[PDB]
């Protein structure tokens, strides 16, 4: 048996790092700004126990210096620097991190946290660089230039140029096709996207004025990661300046949750409810999430639909963590089971935010006026939080004076005989409130919920019960009102004396209805069309008939069976009985019964199978009324 | 002289700790109801590693174990109460810089 | 100046491959089956110039042997094998590929292509393995076992165990919680996902028959990569056997493209139209498309929204290439530019497929009766292709009966005076065909297109013109028909007769309509409600008022501005003129003008502003008629 060390083919290993690790070239600037932020963290930490470490310079900062004339982008920091042996080790050895080897030397009380750990990110400079020169100056050694074009070798020499005092200065000589990184708009885009929360001022040096000889954009990160602070110490003004800076919004936030999760995962988050819903919130199918994931204040990913459910897509926010597993690119998270545990905690703390917001009625009105769809889509899609979300619902009702109430307020007003929450669904608040279905409910003073968005129909299908009270549509067959035995006897007499009329009307309305029945739910309307229980309501039927990308095959059986509910106390219906019991086949009964059915279809909120055959009935009645 | 880099995770009954010492020699592990201690020599240079881990919750030394490989040493500790959640490896809230979670083998089992 | 060669820290570099390259563990079997398919391609190639290379074993196969008793998963491979120097070089050196070194030794005409090139794929074995033993024999050396835990070293020895003749055997000693990769269906899943099209039989040797001593699952890849053959040689049965194998559909494909793209980017593709639209085709918001991308017959990615636009998501297909730049994980590409140039060719050749399919009327009916939503969603989304996709459109019309006809058939039948393609939209062919708006189109013998699904209302926003003919809705203001100057003279005299009635009706209907006007689109209806040209149609409003996830303040800004059009020849209207000329404030005129507006809202396809307020008029006329 012979034992061998593993080797590496350095020529092809460098080719992997340049050609295969990173899916976008722009990241080179976040890797070199991360290395500067680590070099600044190393000297900041070394200075805490020995102030003489800063005698060579006190101002810890980053400078980006695009030079369009030399096709060069220089990245300067006043960080720890590298001795000759640190250049030869840490820039000369692939997969060796001087950041890891420093971090692992420290005691557990150290308040430092550094972005680097793989020992590869410097090489990402060769995504854009034709050649890299790293000028450097540590406190304990001379100034050196390290220099390479990644040709399997690098050179080190004592630097005879301008004396740095202390720092590092990564000069990227850019490839001719990569001079876009020298445009100040480009650098601003890349630094804002990847690096706006790096703990040190990233100054950009731009141009001569038309005079400033070299205009500073004073900082590219003129903002602080406030989420790392204790949430008791931050006022709502400080959260508002951060919300505006994170989002570029001119308006404030409505509500904020700031929290930390601790365990196997440790993370912090800011979740903001924006003042107003984005005008494109559900039309913008591309921007699926408004949560950004950070690790050690460097951006990882945002538009990952695994971070929050699609109904929370309006929450603008930041999630940040010290120790998540990163892909070698650092452009994504490595373990998908972590997103599930983030998502569980984000959703739990969002629903805490909304129930803490619901205590403050005037702010809850401003919220629900714009995010009603999101709560209702949450009840449609989130079976776990459905209970918690049901207490966030707000609806108009027959007892509520152009104002919205919670299901707990409905249940507070429920009469002692009610075992059900009565709701109606429709097109407008007037169209439901005036409807035939609520006529006896309001006569008893039984309260009815008005549902009037299309999303209410997708919601209420999952909202089957609240606090042990079953939600029942007032537009479905066999509606049980809390009637007395004297009323039940009158209903059995009414079903008795109209039994023949229902058979006669079902002969005239054959195939147009499943049945014709005498009803407890009417007072002033002569009839209305309800549906059977097990299918689409008239409102769900109109809604599904308007979804462009739904397969028509489901509409052919989910469309519920129509029942015509007669009002036995109506003067039309009592006269119609006296005609129908005189002659079953009177043409004036045939005309009356079908005109009542078509008027009931409209009153009930269906469409007609042909509006013109109906209009021709009204135009005949108008001719007869005009004497034509 | 300096702690070994470590990765850790748990299951309902067990807490797993991978001490990341390649070509390791002279590996010693001590299990006690309230503590773990680990030490070995590193294979590149014979540098002595030592980790003391005063544990977050109780363990059973009679059902705890360690496996040495030329890649790493894995300890598997028996929880003194199965179904105890471990939010941190040690009783102290100390941020041990050499210790992290093994997110290849971490799962939210609870 | 001092020059140094780059090094690598092998202890950390090996840890990057095991932790940060690969975000899913399951691919270890893909990499080891790819290394086996390359070792088989090497010995197959060497046997072409010297057949004696196979006298050590003439079969070329991959066997997988799970061994639950020992926790090992073995991968036996009757390939080229490795000499002692090839083990020490290619397994011992990270980022060294003996495949790349073999491939670059070949003559430029060599008819071969191998999956390996990076030199790291073997160490993905240590995702799942605690230890790997590679037992191997090459034609030119002894049998050796190479063995390592990835502990910064490996061992090699002259094995002299069971003799292999020529091949390799990777034995993965699995980690105690990675024994899921010994389950037969776990392996069946991973192989049929990643390695289904490897050019050699992958056999699985599992358990016992419960009788043979093992289940010899003769192939996991019974199917062949049919797309690598010449498109002219394959029959429709052979494309059908492949389509059923690729998709698990029980029926043949409806139509197929097979294309060979050559240039700087080279690929082959099979694109299949299913026999039927999937039950979840648009409902599945996770499945963006049914295209799988392969490189050298190994699966790279699926469900990538950059490969084809979401309107083509129904196309099942393979894309395969010899040449695309893979990410280090081999789970995506390094350049989005490659996906754009793929997508242009995929779309360009799908619209060829539909244009070729459109010549076979019976198969085009079987296609369009299911995928017409996709063509219309295409005309909405895809601005480059509307000129192509609008020749794929088929519709009913007022002169085709129940045949679906194209816009070119309409343009063939168009009367010599027609400057416009007239169309109408509604809920059903019966509502639309008998509508008030088409009465004079149908009287003049002008043809009208009938548009019936909600997606048709999106389609005609973008489909403004076909063959230089403007698409004109018959439900919008200013419908000038091709007409004679004597009929125009009489029409302006009819406007002149009715100006007082229009003003009286506008005073009654104030804010209910923008205008009241005499019109020529009617013949036997007394009036209809028509929209402004730049607002929503009566049907577009119905559809937008039913989209659940849309901001009603934002969309409702452009709601249907309504005009009432009067038929000046109707007996209702001439009588109503004589009443309005007798008294502008007659309560009879006020009733008929509101009842005609409400009847015209219905026959024109609007909802009523309150159906109950309307229904009470009909119930009133019934009470009066019955003498109640
Ligand atoms: N601007 C700098 N100032 C001081 N030291 C630096 C600088 N840039 C790089 N280094 C050193 O180079 C080492 C290796 O750098 P690098 O290749 O970027 O990998 P890394 O940052 O350590 N880890 P990672 O970014 O996760 O790949 C660092 O750990 C430092 O020791
Ligand atoms: N089963 C095998 N039979 C013969 N040679 C093999 C086998 N497996 C691996 N090798 C050799 O080992 C080399 C390195 O393997 P590996 O590390 O998997 O990288 P690779 O397959 O060459 N390239 P990649 O798949 O792109 O990562 C191969 O190129 C072969 O020379």
Swiss-Prot record, chains A, C:
Q: Quickly give the catalysed reaction.
A: ATP + H2O = ADP + phosphate + H(+)
Q: How is its activity regulated?
A: In the resting state, through the dimerization of its C-terminal domain, HSP90 forms a homodimer which is defined as the open conformation. Upon ATP-binding, the N-terminal domain undergoes significant conformational changes and comes in contact to form an active closed conformation. After HSP90 finishes its chaperoning tasks of assisting the proper folding, stabilization and activation of client proteins under the active state, ATP molecule is hydrolyzed to ADP which then dissociates from HSP90 and directs the protein back to the resting state.
The biological process GO terms on file are: activation of innate immune response; cardiac muscle cell apoptotic process; cellular response to heat; cellular response to virus; chaperone-mediated autophagy; chaperone-mediated protein complex assembly; mitochondrial transport; neurofibrillary tangle assembly
Question: Mutating residue 528 to S: what's the consequence?
Answer: Loss of S-nitrosylation
Compartment(s) of residence: Nucleus; Cytoplasm; Melanosome; Cell membrane
Q: How is this chain modified after translation?
A: ISGylated. S-nitrosylated; negatively regulates the ATPase activity and the activation of eNOS by HSP90AA1.
| Protein name, entry field | Heat shock protein HSP 90-alpha
Curated annotation (Swiss-Prot), chain B:
Q: In which pathway does it act?
A: Lipid metabolism; prostaglandin biosynthesis
The domain-related comment in the record is: The PXLE motif mediates interaction with EGLN1/PHD2.
Where exactly are the transmembrane stretches of this chain?
none
Q: Does the keyword Nuclease apply?
A: no
Q: What is its biological role?
A: Cytosolic prostaglandin synthase that catalyzes the oxidoreduction of prostaglandin endoperoxide H2 (PGH2) to prostaglandin E2 (PGE2). Molecular chaperone that localizes to genomic response elements in a hormone-dependent manner and disrupts receptor-mediated transcriptional activation, by promoting disassembly of transcriptional regulatory complexes. Facilitates HIF alpha proteins hydroxylation via interaction with EGLN1/PHD2, leading to recruit EGLN1/PHD2 to the HSP90 pathway.
Q: Residue positions of the PTM Phosphoserine?
A: 44, 85, 100
Q: What keywords tag this UniProt record?
A: Acetylation, Chaperone, Cytoplasm, Fatty acid biosynthesis, Fatty acid metabolism, Isomerase, Isopeptide bond, Lipid biosynthesis, Lipid metabolism, Phosphoprotein, Prostaglandin biosynthesis, Prostaglandin metabolism, Ubl conjugation
Q: What is its EC number?
A: 5.3.99.3
Per UniProt, subunit arrangement is: Probably forms a complex composed of chaperones HSP90 and HSP70, co-chaperones STIP1/HOP, CDC37, PPP5C, PTGES3/p23, TSC1 and client protein TSC2. Binds to the progesterone receptor. Interacts with TERT; the interaction, together with HSP90AA1, is required for correct assembly and stabilization of the telomerase holoenzyme complex. Interacts (via PXLE motif) with EGLN1/PHD2, recruiting EGLN1/PHD2 to the HSP90 pathway to facilitate HIF alpha proteins hydroxylation. Interacts with HSP90AA1, FLCN, FNIP1 and FNIP2.
Lineage of the native species? Eukaryota, Metazoa, Chordata, Craniata, Vertebrata
Spell out the reaction equation it catalyses. prostaglandin H2 = prostaglandin E2
| Encoding gene, per UniProt annotation | PTGES3
Q: Tell me the protein family, please.
A: Belongs to the p23/wos2 family.
Find the cross-link Glycyl lysine isopeptide (Lys-Gly) (interchain with G-Cter in SUMO2).
35, 65
Q: How is it modified after translation?
A: Proteolytically cleaved by caspase-7 (CASP7) in response to apoptosis, leading to its inactivation.
- Annotated source species: Homo sapiens
Listed name of the protein: Prostaglandin E synthase 3
Part of the whole protein covered: 1 to 110 of 160
Q: Output the Gene Ontology cellular-component terms.
A: chromosome, telomeric region; cytosol; nucleoplasm; nucleus; protein folding chaperone complex; protein-containing complex; telomerase holoenzyme complex
- The reply on keyword Protease is no
């Amino acid at each position: 048996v012979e034992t061998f060390a593993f080797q590496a083919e350095i020529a092809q290993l460098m080719s992997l790092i340049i050609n295969t690790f990173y899916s976008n070239k722009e990241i080179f600037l976040r890797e070199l700004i991360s290395n500067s932020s680590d070099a600044l963290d190393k000297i900041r930490y070394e200075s805490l126990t020995d102030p003489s470490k800063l005698d060579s310079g006190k101002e810890l900062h980053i400078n980006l210096i695009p030079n369009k004339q030399d096709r060069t982008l220089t990245i300067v920091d006043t960080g720890i620097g590298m001795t000759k042996a640190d250049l030869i080790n840490n820039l000369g050895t692939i997969a060796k991190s001087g950041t890891k080897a420093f971090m692992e030397a420290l005691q557990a009380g150290a308040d430092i946290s550094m972005i680097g750990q793989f020992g590869v990110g410097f090489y990402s400079a060769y995504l854009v660089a034709e050649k890299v020169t790293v000028i450097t100056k540590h406190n304990d050694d001379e100034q050196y230039a390290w220099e390479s074009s990644a040709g399997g070798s690098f050179t080190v020499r004592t630097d005879t140029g301008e004396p740095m005092g202390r720092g590092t200065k990564v000069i990227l000589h850019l490839k001719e096709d990569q001079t876009e990184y020298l445009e100040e708009r480009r650098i601003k885009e890349i630094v804002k996207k990847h690096s706006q929360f790096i703990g040190y001022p990233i100054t950009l040096f731009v141009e001569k004025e038309r005079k400033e000889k070299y205009i500073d954009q004073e900082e590219l990160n003129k903002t602080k990661p406030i989420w790392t602070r204790n949430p008791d110490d931050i006022t709502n003004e400080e959260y508002g300046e951060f919300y505006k800076s994170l989002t570029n919004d001119w308006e404030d936030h409505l509500a904020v949750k700031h929290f930390s999760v601790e365990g196997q995962l440790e993370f912090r988050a800011l979740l903001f409810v924006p003042r107003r819903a984005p005008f494109d919130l559900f039309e913008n199918r591309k921007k699926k999430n408004n949560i950004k994931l950070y690790v050690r204040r460097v951006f990882i990913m945002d538009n990952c639909e695994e971070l929050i459910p699609e109904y929370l897509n309006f929450i603008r926010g930041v999630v940040d963590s010290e120790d998540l597993p990163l892909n070698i690119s650092r452009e994504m998270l490595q373990q998908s089971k972590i997103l599930k545990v983030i998502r569980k905690n984000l959703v739990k703390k969002c629903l805490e935010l909304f129930t803490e917001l619901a205590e403050d009625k005037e702010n809850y009105k401003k919220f629900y006026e714009q995010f009603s769809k999101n709560i209702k889509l949450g009840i449609h899609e989130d079976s776990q939080n459905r209970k918690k979300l049901s207490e966030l619902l707000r609806y108009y009702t027959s007892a509520s004076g152009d104002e919205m109430v919670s299901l707990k307020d409905y249940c507070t007003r429920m009469k002692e005989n009610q075992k059900h929450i009565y709701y109606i669904t429709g097109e407008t608040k007037d169209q439901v409130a005036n409807s035939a279905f609520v006529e006896r409910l309001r006569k008893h003073g039984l309260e009815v919920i008005y549902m009037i968005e299309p999303i209410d129909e997708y919601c209420v299908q999952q909202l089957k019960e609240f606090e042990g009270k079953t939600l029942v549509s007032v537009t479905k067959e066999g509606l049980e009102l809390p009637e007395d035995e004297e009323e039940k006897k009158k209903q059995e007499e009414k079903k008795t004396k109209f039994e023949n009329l229902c058979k006669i009307m079902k002969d005239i309305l054959e195939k147009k209805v499943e049945k014709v029945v005498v009803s407890n739910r009417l007072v002033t309307s002569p009839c209305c069309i309800v549906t059977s229980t097990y299918g689409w309501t008239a409102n769900m039927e109109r809604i599904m008939k308007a979804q462009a990308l739904r397969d028509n095959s489901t509409m052919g059986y989910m469309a519920a069976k129509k029942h015509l509910e007669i009002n036995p106390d109506h003067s039309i219906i009592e006269t119609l009985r006296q005609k129908a019991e005189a002659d079953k086949n009177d043409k004036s009964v045939k005309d009356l019964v079908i005109l009542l059915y078509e008027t009931a279809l409209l009153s009930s909120g269906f469409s007609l199978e042909d509006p013109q055959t109906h209009a021709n009935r009204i135009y005949r009645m108008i001719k007869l009324g005009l004497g034509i | 002289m300096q702690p070994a880099s470590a990765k850790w995770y748990d299951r309902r009954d067990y807490v797993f700790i991978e001490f990341c010492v390649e070509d390791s020699k002279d590996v010693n592990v001590n299990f006690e109801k309230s503590k773990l201690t680990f030490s070995c020599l590193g294979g590149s240079d014979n540098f002595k590693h030592l980790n003391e881990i005063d544990l977050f919750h109780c363990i059973d030394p009679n059902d705890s174990k360690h496996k040495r490989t030329d890649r790493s040493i894995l300890c598997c500790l028996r929880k003194g109460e199965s179904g105890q959640s471990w939010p941190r490896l040690t009783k102290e809230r100390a941020k041990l810089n050499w210790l992290s979670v093994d997110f290849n083998n971490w799962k939210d089992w609870e």
